[PDB]
Design a protein around this ligand. Structure first.
Ligand code: XRJ
Length: 663
């Protein structure tokens, strides 16, 4: 399974051994990066003018002048051939030769190559990743790993633009990077070049830029500094800003100035890209004409980025046609998946889908904006690389599975199981959702409805859920201890813990359904309650970011199933034995009674999704949003004036909608 799949491929049953004795032709002429790969593959073998001939080089080189008619005439294209006599590795250009070797490495199996003939090239000119999310920027080591990953999957673009990098955005975009960061960026560019990736440094000056000579010159000075560090591609982002920086005329004038006074003056600058303020259709204002102004004034060689019909959306034919009409050029797609900086309590490990597969000529580029979890994002990145190179042959599920098997060969099935139930985003402001747990969804839906109505559920459906919960535990435990991709495991470990707890809770609830005698049911009930508390603990101690703290997993299908199944069987138990067991599905140490919604704890905040009772006395900070008071014993009370009032560290245990307290 070659990924990306080549444009043209012909194979037949013939096994060629990786020759013990080879003759390299064009090792001096070909792309040095491609040669280094070939020599690592050919290491151990003998090099001489005897044995099998191996021709490598670019179109025009002496080594492959013979096969020049087979070499596709596209950028980054190449021709690859293997048979009993000769191996050919000829690129249309140097990057093409490199890509020929990346395919060749996939063909090599047990030192045996298939008799194949390949003519290949990308359908989309620029393909890769934009690190453009809010949150903790990728570590240096993560980025180094990413760049090698891009090379292997023929992604030629990495756009550096972490929103929370102070030297990328306001106010310190005017300042050069410190020596430490500068040295690191320098290395990244070098490693990017070694993997045939264009390192595109982006700048985000819009929020506080003044349209004068001072800021213009400082921007160019900053660009000049990056150039000295080795950067040869550049970008200017005007996304998520207000004020004068949103002026389309001024944006275009600035980019054209950069183009003519810097990009065209330098001898070796490649990509020049801008992200508009109106970067999707829904945010595009029809009463004005921001986009058509950019389209007309911005020099045509300059790329304009676009996220689709919405901030989070999949690219359609009518969608790309709509934007292209206005910007007078093929849009440079910025796809906001698997970025999760607005649902930071979720991992988005599902397959890549939704994007039209016939519109390759309608886009100048396609890059993905990923999670701040770098390794975890490789599932989607690997898939986008496949899609972008050969959209006509893009296989959603096969590529997903191939990605997982590549990222974690030693535990691919376990990672599949985990990712299968960690793909949906849950409710969010963008209304963007993904499928999850569709394998077991039908059995869960039938089981629960039959259980609710008091009908007999299918034995098969019950056993499916049992198998699933069991498999989830195996996967969670094996993943925790996996040492093949340690950085990956560090990223997902909190979710894996929550994942196992979900599975354990699921098992115990099904036993409550199966349960015959009373004391056994009660044992299971108490165990579930304890597991709920454990999930609460993880939710409060892991991933404690300011926006969506905590750890959520298997939210679309499985947790609702377990919660509703637990509530129902407890309800039936109370009816039967005249008991009054609590059917609460999520642990909450605090309480709230009123003239009624579930409470939630987020960081040092207690909130309603009336009287609240905390599990202890804390110093109060404020109460942001019958009377309004506070108390420590629930007998004596103390009123506060809402001016959303302050508490001034006053001891509080009762409150009569968010309460903030001190640690
Ligand atoms: C509604 C404003 C937030 C939109 C921000 N989106 C992403 C969603 O988190 C974020 O990662 C990034 O800054 C992006 C901006 C954007 O869409 N650029 C083309």
């Amino acid at each position: 399974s070659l990924q990306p799949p080549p444009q043209q491929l012909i194979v037949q049953n013939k096994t060629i051994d990786l020759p013990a004795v080879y003759q390299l032709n064009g090792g001096e002429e070909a792309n040095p990066h491609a040669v280094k790969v070939l020599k690592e593959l050919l290491s151990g073998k003998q090099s001489s003018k005897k044995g099998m001939l191996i021709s490598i080089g670019e179109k025009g080189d002496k080594s492959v002048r013979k096969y020049s008619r087979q070499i596709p005439d596209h950028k980054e294209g190449y021709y690859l051939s293997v048979n009993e006599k000769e191996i050919v590795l000829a690129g249309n250009d140097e990057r093409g030769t490199y890509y020929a070797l990346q395919t060749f490495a996939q063909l090599l199996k047990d030192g045996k190559l298939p008799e194949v003939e390949i003519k290949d090239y990308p359908s989309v000119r620029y393909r890769g990743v934009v690190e453009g999310f809010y949150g903790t920027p990728w570590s240096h080591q993560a980025r180094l790993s990413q760049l090698k990953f891009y090379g292997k999957n023929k992604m030629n673009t990495y756009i550096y633009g972490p929103k929370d990098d102070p030297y990328h955005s306001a106010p310190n975009w005017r300042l050069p990077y410190p020596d430490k960061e500068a040295a690191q960026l320098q290395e990244l560019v070098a490693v990017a070049n070694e993997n045939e990736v264009d390192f595109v440094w982006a700048i985000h000056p819009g929020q506080d830029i003044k349209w004068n000579k001072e800021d213009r010159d400082l921007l160019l000075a900053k660009f000049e500094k990056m150039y000295q560090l080795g950067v040869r591609s550049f970008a200017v982002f005007f996304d998520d800003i207000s004020g004068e920086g949103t002026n389309p005329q001024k944006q275009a004038e600035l980019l054209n100035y950069i183009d003519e006074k810097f990009a065209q003056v330098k001898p070796d600058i490649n990509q020049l890209v801008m992200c508009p303020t109106e970067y999707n259709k829904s945010w595009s204002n029809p009463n004005g004409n921001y986009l058509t102004t950019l389209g007309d004034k911005l020099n045509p060689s300059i790329q304009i980025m676009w996220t689709g019909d919405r901030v989070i959306s999949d690219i359609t034919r009518d969608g790309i046609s709509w934007i292209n009409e206005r910007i007078k050029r093929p849009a440079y797609i910025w796809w906001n998946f698997p970025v999760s900086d607005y649902v930071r309590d979720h991992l988005l490990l599902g397959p890549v889908y939704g994007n039209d597969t016939t519109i390759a000529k309608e886009m100048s580029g396609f890059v993905t904006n990923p999670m701040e979890h770098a390794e975890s994002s490789k599932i989607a990145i690997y898939s986008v690389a496949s899609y972008a190179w050969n959209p006509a042959k893009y296989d959603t599920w096969q590529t997903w599975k191939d990605a997982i098997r590549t990222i974690l060969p030693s535990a691919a099935e376990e990672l599949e199981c985990f990712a299968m139930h960690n793909s949906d985003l849950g409710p969010n402001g963008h209304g963007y959702r993904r499928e999850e747990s569709m394998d077991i969804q039908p059995a869960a839906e039938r089981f629960l409805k039959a259980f609710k109505e008091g009908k007999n559920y299918d034995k098969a459906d019950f056993e499916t859920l049992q198998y699933t919960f069991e498999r989830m535990k195996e996967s969670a435990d094996i993943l925790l201890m996996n040492t093949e991709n340690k950085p990956l495991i560090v990223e997902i470990t909190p979710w894996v813990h929550q994942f196992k707890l979900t599975a354990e809770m699921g098992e115990e609830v099904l036993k409550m359904v199966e349960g015959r005698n009373e004391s056994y049911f009660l044992r299971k009930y108490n165990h579930v309650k304890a597991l709920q508390q454990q999930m609460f603990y993880i939710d409060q101690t892991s991933n404690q970011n300011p926006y969506q703290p905590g750890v959520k997993t298997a939210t679309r299908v499985i947790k609702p199933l377990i919660d509703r199944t637990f509530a129902t069987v407890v309800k039936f138990f109370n009816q039967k034995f005249n008991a009054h067991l609590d059917a609460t599905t999520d642990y909450m140490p605090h309480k709230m009674i009123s003239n009624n919604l579930p409470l939630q704890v987020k960081a040092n905040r207690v909130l309603i999704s009336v009287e609240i009772e905390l599990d202890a006395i804390y110093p109060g900070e404020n109460i942001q949003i019958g009377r309004l008071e506070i108390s420590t014993d629930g007998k004596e009370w103390k009123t506060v004036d809402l001016k959303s009032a302050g508490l001034q560290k006053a001891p509080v245990k009762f409150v009569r909608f968010v309460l903030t307290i001190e640690k």
